[PDB]
Symmetry: D2
């Protein structure tokens, strides 16, 4: 094949530097890129209405937390709206983030659309005019982007089409981002839905990631200038089998070692429905896994970092500091976890998570 450099040494350096800053030791990502409809559900659970003000305020609560979170947060993924909002101190959010030492990120996908001829499978849209959008976003303070593809495990899924199509669209997105000096976070999310065991998820994860990396190569993607945002390898939500977090860690790291080239700067795990403590515990075990891990294994959590913060807030401006405190604590917990130094005894024995699917009722 013939080389026609997509990027110059200068462009490669910029991308790599950005990617490394985000995942520097002890740092992770705060995923606060929920679209208006998504954040609406969250605000409703706390009896708060979905207005631009409450959204701006809620985002402000997280973004303006004290400097204790500074060394914990390498980057923050924002939704379009929030990128153009300002804090009470008059500063645009992207500036608040940068002043605190974090990198600003932007969600660029436009949602999933169904693939005809499949069993409820999807692909993701958002490529049209992405180049110009990325140029504007870069100018407006964003240095990294996020694009999410969804895949489901079932009797006939993921199908070969779904795997090929999602891997290809992720590569297109990644290519466009790098041309505009933006680091793309590749997110091939495999849903935990179903009653499949740990091994089936590991198998599917390995097949999906292999396809993802072949596509990135085909599209001439600069790996050092990217981050991978995968699901941890866990059993299905309805699985009746019990697993320790060391098993989840082992399966997760094993899957990654078999598919992710060491040039990839970092892997930022999505917690996908896991509770705050469970997500920290799992990330900690992953970093404690005795296998050689050549990339940073950190977090890119949404709910796992916000659950207790949103709860404590509950629309009441009064509870501002206490709500921020909850967030600061999860940030600190996960900072320790991505370094393999979060203390707990691999806890799962009494602190509950609905193990109804393991009890006698699941029979």
């Amino acid at each position: 094949p013939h080389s026609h450099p997509a990027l110059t040494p200068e462009q490669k350096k910029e991308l790599s530097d950005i990617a490394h800053r985000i995942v520097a030791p002890g740092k992770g990502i705060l995923a606060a890129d929920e679209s208006t409809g998504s954040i609406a559900k969250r605000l409703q659970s706390i009896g708060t209405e979905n207005t631009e003000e409450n959204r701006r305020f809620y985002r402000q609560l997280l973004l303006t937390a004290d400097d204790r979170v500074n060394p914990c947060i390498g980057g923050v993924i924002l939704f379009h709206e929030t990128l153009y909002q300002k804090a009470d101190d008059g500063r645009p959010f992207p500036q608040v983030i940068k002043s605190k030492g974090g990198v600003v990120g932007i969600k660029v996908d436009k949602g999933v659309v169904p693939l005809a001829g499949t069993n409820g499978e999807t692909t993701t849209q958002g490529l049209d005019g992405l180049s110009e959008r990325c140029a504007q976003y870069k100018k407006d303070g964003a240095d990294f982007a996020k694009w999410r593809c969804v895949l489901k495990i079932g009797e006939h899924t993921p199908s070969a089409l779904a795997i090929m199509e999602n891997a290809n669209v992720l590569a297109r997105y990644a290519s466009i981002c790098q041309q505009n000096g933006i680091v793309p976070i590749v997110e091939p999310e495999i849903l935990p839905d179903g009653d499949h065991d740990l091994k089936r998820c590991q198998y599917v994860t390995e097949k999906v990631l292999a396809a993802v990396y072949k596509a990135l190569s085909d599209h001439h993607i600069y790996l050092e200038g990217t981050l991978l945002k995968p699901n941890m390898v866990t059993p299905g939500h309805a699985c009746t089998q019990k697993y320790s977090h060391e098993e989840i860690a082992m399966a997760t790291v094993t899957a990654l070692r078999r598919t992710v080239p060491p040039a990839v700067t970092g892997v930022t795990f999505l917690s996908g429905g896991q509770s705050e403590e469970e997500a920290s515990i799992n990330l900690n075990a992953i970093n404690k896994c005795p296998l050689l891990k050549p990339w940073a294994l950190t977090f890119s959590y949404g709910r796992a970092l916000q659950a207790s913060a949103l709860k404590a807030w509950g629309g009441k401006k009064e509870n501002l500091k206490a709500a921020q405190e909850e967030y600061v604590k999860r940030a600190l917990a996960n900072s320790l976890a991505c370094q393999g130094k979060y203390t707990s005894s691999g806890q799962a024995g009494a602190a509950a998570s609905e193990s109804l699917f393991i009890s006698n009722h699941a029979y």
Copy 2:
């Protein structure tokens, strides 16, 4: 593998009926889908300012040509603007076309975008929200669509990436159209630029079409409900070798016979820079080729059907009937040509009006 029907027998029948109606014996397509930017270049050549009124007038001149064209035009591809315009008599353009027995088509792609890491190669965008657009267009009178991918022959082109990427995007587009009752015209245009010979073009065309059909299969496309719009197989514009129309015909038909499944309802050739007469002569020869041709071989001409009309018009409202006459004459010529009955007085085809690249000056 496992089937999850993309289309019901009812949806299939409709798509099939539409495709067959467009390429019925003696019928072809008028491609009047130029966008503002392209139409500008056309109007400028004749000294007519690019105004909505002049674009609407010009399209009216073509669409309201007398019934003699009716037996010749199976379909008309329109640009978005034109689909919502009306004729002087108040009738919406789509209705005018339909009253004359034609099927209305709409251009749905959003142009080509560069593929990084290639030698100036592109892919085409337009997938975002395509489903909703197709649903609207359908309600508004359109039954078929056009999407154009462009590839070029050169030292390192087309590359494996460009071939795969364009074939895949074409399949995605086709899939979305079929879900909305719209027949997709698959257009993988290989540019005639360069000094490559006939055989070079034949080779690349065969490789390209093979990729296109494999992609359509992977995406579960209903072939009977599609039309192919390829480039005829010709030598590059700067080739120094002289060829006869019988040679281009043999090469074109051979390339298609080796790649296009018989289920494909029809092949509507693009003129690709050929003069009006040349396009008719080549299409005629293609239809008189001894080889078995299991699909209708017709036209989907833009300039090849408008060159004389536009010139004759000259923006002068007084030249209307004369300009329309030129158009009617080209439509009649191609109608005969798509049936292999176009034998100009003297039973022969015209020769090259210049062909400087075959003279001593090309040495």
Copy 3:
């Protein structure tokens, strides 16, 4: 891509001439390439010992049948051993076939081998030294070859791996044959085993054939110099739903129309365990199918042409004529069937069949 002509005009010509001769109007193929292990069971069912002489004699019985079979047989596929055996008159079997107007073919594969990590799927071996073998076989009177790949329909089969691997091995084989002036019959047999229905078989057939042709294109195969030997589209042997022959014909023709390019010279169907009468009736229905078929649709039957001859033979030399007649009759019937001229004779009582398990214990 870039061309480096795999074949010269003269080589293509030769392959094209051979392919056309085999499938000329009213002609089909006698598949008599049973290996030592396969024919042993045939001889055992008729209480005859499996010796070289018995194999030579049985083969001679078929090859020397009266002149009426001449116009019905375009080719005969032989097993290695038979190619070097002689008729009682001291004439090599290849000579006897040629004197009767037939083309000599040789089975070149070395059987199926398991594909690890699959649910009992296989690929086919035989590529090693195939080029040398082919050059020798051509020298010895063989003009075409046969290679059989086997695919199975089940819940998880055929898998993407099986489809890809078998298509690629068929393409490697076809390439080597053509380089040695041997026309390759591509045989991607989808076994009829299972309880799947017609739609299921059609779906799978369309998917495998599309992969087969993409593979042949990638490997630069000259399609005009090849023949396709597929299974007809039928329900699984264990399927309870009874389908009409019209349905089977429609499903088979539709599948081929959507995947087999017009350049393929002919399709020589395998009977796949169908009774002699059934195989002829289905072949006739396929040829009467109202859809356009741009390729010859004929037979390449093994047991569907021999069941009665073998039975009527029984092992006794005296039965020579009896057996030959049964074969001649079947050849004639299929010669008519491949032209849509077969008048289904129906049935009453019995004719011939295979095996013994639940009948006449004490005779």
Copy 4:
């Protein structure tokens, strides 16, 4: 997709264990697997006749070197003949090797064969009856195998077909080896022939390796139970631009980091015509490269470990010790090199002797 375990936990355990033994710290592989035709060349260059006794003597010379080589040689790749030969003391070579702590390997490919339609490109044969051969070899003392695929850099090479085909055949071979308890060394050698530069070689190496790992994933290969044997990234033999060992090291490690998953147990570089000293220095520089390398980076040298031993021997049994000493010297130098602990004297040394040519004389 769905899993159907190719291997059991126990089988995986054995494969992983063997792979790790071969590439243990400070250890490399002696590639003494030259066929009769290749070894004949080396013998001729030193005035010795190609005979079984002389071949046995030469191999014995290398295999019976003093105990200092024991910690240096993790494995020895033998040609079929040698595996069944015995040393002067009656012990079969496999026994001699195991007694000194090494693992016994066997070359299992049957050479390269041309791919029709390419610019002199090849694929490799040897799959027929490979499982049975592996079963025999395992039983006879071999624990790993080697299969060589050859790719070439040029204007249109390596082509898409060559890359896909060679990667697919390596995967098939690797699968069969693992089913028989044999660790396969995957050798996708990109020839140093040509005038292309360093960047071109790196570009090609990255594309080839990505294809290789995608194929290995598709065929369900257990990566932990494999070794990769690639070429170092260097300029073509005919390139006139001078490069430093640091540039070679950076290019090589960078290419591997972008394509070779961490799970791969080790990378055993082939020397590719490099002089003994050159091969040691480059290997050392590679291990000195500051970039993170999650796999063992060692040697699998043929000519680079035998050049001096061969000439010092000169066909005279008397020169046995002198010859063995030269070998031990190169083996010790590379043991240090694969640990980044090697140092040079400043210039060429006893390694350069043969040098590059261009049609000087065919011999």
